[model samples]
Each structure stands twice: as C-alpha cells, then as structure tokens.
Target chain A: MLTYGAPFNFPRWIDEHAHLLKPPVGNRQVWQDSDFIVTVVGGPNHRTDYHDDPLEEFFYQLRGNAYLNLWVDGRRERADLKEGDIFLLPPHVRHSPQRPEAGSACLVIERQRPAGMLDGFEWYCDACGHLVHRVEVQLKSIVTDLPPLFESFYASEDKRRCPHCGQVHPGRAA
Target chain B: MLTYGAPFNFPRWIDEHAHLLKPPVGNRQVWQDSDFIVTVVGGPNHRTDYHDDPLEEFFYQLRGNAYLNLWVDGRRERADLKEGDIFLLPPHVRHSPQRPEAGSACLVIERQRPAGMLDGFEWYCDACGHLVHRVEVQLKSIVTDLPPLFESFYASEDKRRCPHCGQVHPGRAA
Candidate 1:
C-alpha cells in the first residue's frame, strides 16, 4: 500500500491531456483543490457577453491571441492579449471577451468561490449602453455553472432588451 | 489627472515585451496586485535544488518542454510538462524542478506571502540520499533574495558532503 509519509504526487502537468480536450470553446477542468481551480479554456469563434465574477481570475495566453473588452473602475477598455501574455482581473469588474484568432487558446486560473460569495453575469446595451440583463449566482463550478448562465441569457428575448433605451443588444454564439 | 472613474489599462499582454526580456532563465515579474502576483519564468539548462515554499503556486507552460523531478509520497516521480500544459503546487510540498529543454518557458502565479511565513531551499545527497544543506528564508523578492540563498548552498563544500554516509554529492553549475 502507498503510505502517507512520502510526497503527494500530483500529475501537476496538463499538456499530455491536450488531445482529450477540445479547445477554443470547451473548457478542460484540469486541477481543483480547496484553494484554487484551474481551467484550460479557449475562446469560441464568435464572442461572449460580459461576466462579473466574485472570485479573482487570472489568464495566461498559450496559443494565438485574445481580446477582451472590460469595464473596470467604471470606464471601458480594450485588452489585446498576445501569446504568453498574462492578466488578472479583480472580482468586481465586468468583461466581454471576444473570440481569439484561429488556434488561439488560454489558461484560466480562478479561485473557487467561498461559501455564500456572490457572482454574476451581465449584458449591456450596445446602442445606448444601458443595462440589458443580469445573472446573480453562487457558482460551484464554472465549467458546469457557466453554460446554463449563457443559455439563460440567450434564450430569452426579454432579457436581451435594454431596460432604459429599449434597444435589444446585438449578440451571437458559435 | 487619472481619476478613479477611468479604466486601469494594464498592457495585459507580454509577447510584445519579449524584446525587452532575455528568455529561458530571467523571470519577468508581470503583474502584482493587493491579492496576487504573476511571473513568467523559464527553467535553467541545469538541474535545480528542491524548494519548500509557504504559498500555493500555479504554472502554465508556454513553450518547448519541461522535466521536473518531484519527491512525492516518499519516492520520486518525473513530471513531463509540455507546451500549453498547466499545473498547481500545494503550499506545503517540497519540490525539485529539473531544468527544462531549450526554448521552454512557463508562467508562474503565486499569492504574496503574508508576514511571518517561513520558506526554505534544500538539497539532498545523491548517493546516500542523506540531508545536504538547508537555508531559512523570508523572501521579499525572488530575484533579489534567492541569489544569496543559492550562494550559501553552492559555496560551501562542507555542506555538500553527506553527514551520515560520507558520500560526496555531485555538484556543478552553468
């Protein structure tokens, strides 16, 4: 029997498992412990709406480039992420990540939300920049929890309509 | 004047910065906030000793190939880190990362250690596997603080000798 006195052998590397993962859209849940969770996620060919998570998130680009539109400190900015580049987002800002170039990929590391922590996703009006929709969640897993959040945001037309400006936000999926 | 209402535009990418940095060894400190720190580091062409750190760490491989010899569960295991692979290390484990292949690079993300956290570097005997040397450290900066610890281990021939078996460890540097 393997005893406890030796070191804890974590596989710790994920490249050999790349073939098993479909990148650019599908997220491969790589490592999960009490303190942190890691996902190998790539951008879809289309685009995604804005997300405001309760946990700090870090990204490292591995293949191609990534582009993100972020609302931070109440103003908007565009982030052009190149290969081998890395960035971190605090828990409060909202960000819309555009589809990376062909073959583009990234490694996303996020802290698992503590018990009772609040998280959310939102879409703003493209025409008037008004609030369109919002989702408040206490997420257990992003690979599992985020897909339904996307579906919920996309499936309803009422949620897509801007609250004050009455313009339906322009959005699509791959 | 920059106001709090404007975006904090961090050049969230690093490929453009490659021209400024000499890769394969020099670790580039990319970003640090009140919450965490991100660094892009490449392994040396030669072997390195084991380190015990006080903070959990994460890794994302960006290029070439990497080989790490880890002492886990009391024995040794080889971790082959490939391009686009990622891994995480728990705070308590002591690990020895072998030198990676030419052109290999990795992104390491770690939390800033709080005050009074203990950390160290250690080497073991090659033949008898006995204890070799150890250094206690309170690292404020890896680039600045680690050189002295390295010098302490490498400069002393007495520390390279195994106390139990009288076995002299094979040691050299690039």
Candidate 2:
C-alpha cells in the first residue's frame, strides 16, 4: 500500500536515496496498489543473466541507454532499449538487461503475482547452445530477494559452468 | 496481447498518429494484456471533477504540468503533478486530473476490472456541497466510454444544476 496522489520524481528519488538500498544492486519501491507496483532499479550488474519473471513486466528507461536481451523459449534474441523508450514483456519471458556501472536506471511495473507462482533464471551454454541451467525461486520481496538471487548465481562455479560443453563462464565471483 | 521488447517512442508516437484518436480527447491504448493495460490520455477538459474508477490507476506526466485533484470518501483534495512525475491511485478513490489545453499528456496504467465491478462519476454541489448527481458504469472501453460520459454530464441541464441551492455551474457543453 502507498499514499495516493503524490507525484514521484523517479530520477531524483533514485539519485537522492539509492544509498538506502542493499549493496551492489540499488533498488527501491516507489509506489504500490492492488492492481500493480512500481520499483526503481539501478543495479550495475554486468554479471546479470537472462531471467524470467512470473508476472508480465513493463520497463521505462530513465537516464541511461541499455540493451534488453529477449529470448524465444531457449533461443537468443536482443532488443535495444534506449533512453526514452518503453518495453513490455510477457510472463515467464526471459530478458537480460545490460547496464553500465553508472547512470543506468529503469522504472519497472508489474502485477503482484498470485500465490504459488515461481520466478526463474536461465543460462544458455555459449559453446553448444545447450540449456545449461535454470534456477527457480519463490519470490518473497523483489527488493530483498532479487540481489541475493543474482549474487549466488554470479558467485558460484558449479552453477555458472555449462555441463554439456564443460565450459565455465567468467565474471565477478565466478 | 501486444508485442513485447519493441522500443515504443511515446512522444513521437503521439505526434505522428494522434489524428487517429477520437476528437476532443486524443487517447489510445499503448499496450494491453490479461493482467494490465497502458493508455495515453491527452484530454484538456478544465471541467473535469473527482470521479471514482473501479480499478486502481497509475499516471505518469509526460510533456506538460498538470494538477491531480483527489478526494477521500467522495470529498475534495488536491495533489500537484509536474512533468516527469508519476502518481498512483487506489480503486474507488475519486480523482480529477486537470491539464492545459495543449502539450499536456499522461501515460495511464490500470487493470481491466473483472466480473461485475462498477465504476462511477459523482459531483458535489458547488453551492450546497450535497451529492448532486452520480452515474454508475461498466467500463468496457476508456477510449469510447470516457468522452461520452463527460459529455452527458456537461450537456444535460438537469445534471448540471444543483437541486438544493438552485445553482447552475457553467462549462463547455452547457
């Protein structure tokens, strides 16, 4: 729940209070209602992967130019998300949003998925195009739940390695 | 459902094809799904008043400045909304968005109310503060249903006049 009718400054709010967020990936909840919720995400995760959410999500680019990598089932697809552009995705449709260390942010809106819905992350083997691994999660809170989900994936050697090609991805914590 | 991951240019889309909108209010559906819907609204009616929607709504101010008039329990309140600002409203809470004659637009998001939920418009008498009139509706389409709803309110002399105080407020249609 949130206070109704208050105008929210997305950029200012993100810039002014991003320190209140958890380390590494900065995120904050701006507003929420019965129908949907709004969150500002400013994570500089160059190590992030293609992840599918349980609810259909909408993203509005704020200050930076980023690329949205979409996937058709298990195949790779890319969509350019520039500044001043809006993109929407269906439920369980995976997307990899690449952002720089500074000045990259997005306003994401999505429904509060009903009970028993599970969110996920997927990795494709670069060498053989094999479905490397998929991680499913029961999301309790996007702000608190998301950063750890990303950290463990990036930190693990076994999880980042492709079983089919016996290749391990190189990145931070991996 | 609309195609996901395509970059949508909001200002350019409004400028290039706004003629496609029905007259008086230039509005269009930007995206829709079973879970949520997004619409662009560019109505300049200074005659707008506090009214209730069955579904919760979110508004992001685009080009110009505007004022959002809200009401708690069908009484009047106000919130100032400027450019690049976002605001969210609860279901059944009354709101009246005031905008300039031109260069004022908003991106609105709301749910498609399921089953038999009803929306409404209400007017507190200018002179006596009595609930002068109220209209209940089943909102099939905002693009088609909204303008006519406003029209009927301002057009009919019976709807415009306050019965207790015999006060007749004047506006566009009346």
Worst 10 residues of 1 chain A by lDDT: A1-10
TM-scores of chain A, one for each prediction: 0.81, 0.80
User: lDDT values of the candidates?
Assistant: 0.64, 0.69
Model 2: per-residue lDDT, tens digit, B43-74? Answer: 55464556688777888887667776667654
- State how far residue A154 of model 1 sits from its true place (Å): 4.6
Clashing pairs in 1: A6-B73, A6-B74, A7-B72, A7-B73, A7-B74
Write model 1 residue lDDT over B1-174, tens digit each, in one string: 111122222233344454433433356676544355667665454555777877777765665566566676666677666665556777756777654454456666777666788787877787766678777777677556776677666777787777888876665552
CAPRI tier for the interface of model 2: medium
TM-score for all predictions?
Answer: 0.70, 0.83
lDDT of 1 by residue, A1-174 (tens): 112222222233334444533443456766554366777665454455788777677776666676778875566677766675666777677877765454456667777777889788888877777778888888887777877787877778788888898876655552
Q: What does the lDDT read for residue A23 in candidate 2?
A: 45
Question: What lDDT would candidate 1 get against the real structure?
Answer: 0.64
